[PDB]
Design a protein around this ligand. Sequence first.
Ligand SMILES: [Cl-]
Ligand SMILES: [Fe+3]
Length: 186
Amino acid sequence: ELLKPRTLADLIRILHELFAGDEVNVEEVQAVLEAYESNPAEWALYAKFDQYRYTRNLVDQGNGKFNLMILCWGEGHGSSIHDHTDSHAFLKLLQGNLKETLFDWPDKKSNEMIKKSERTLRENQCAYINDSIGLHRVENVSHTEPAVSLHLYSPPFDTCHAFDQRTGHKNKVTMTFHSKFGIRTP
Ligand SMILES: [Cl-]
Ligand SMILES: [Fe+3]
């Protein structure tokens, strides 16, 4: 029985219930993420920005079933075109707007990766992707407003692939944390 999360802490408790088993009800998870109304005081501890690129700030390790983290995107900061390592990936905007561009998996032939679609994700909205849907790039295209998003990955993963938009060629990247549980982790 899904109830509205009253706070970030309440959301986390509810997520631990939704991930208590071995499968994932994507629609329920997305609905509860969407229902949490972003309250900046509740997540200020995790919102640690870097001047030069977006940061990943671990919030909860989900008893091993998921990683929940907050990503902080300066003006103009964005990702590579990337996959999600056979995991579910949920993205909820806490502050600002992000542009999500979708791409198909490349063929073996070296070719330009052409976007399949794009959308602007707005405050409090929750998007979802997995490798069966495709690849994406996520970008804060604003010149004036930093963005903050809440990401849930299940199972957790610490590597993924970045794709060269010119060729479709992929390279494995290891994902790093800027902080964990509010503590900067050099
Ligand atoms: Cl993502
Ligand atoms: Fe992603």
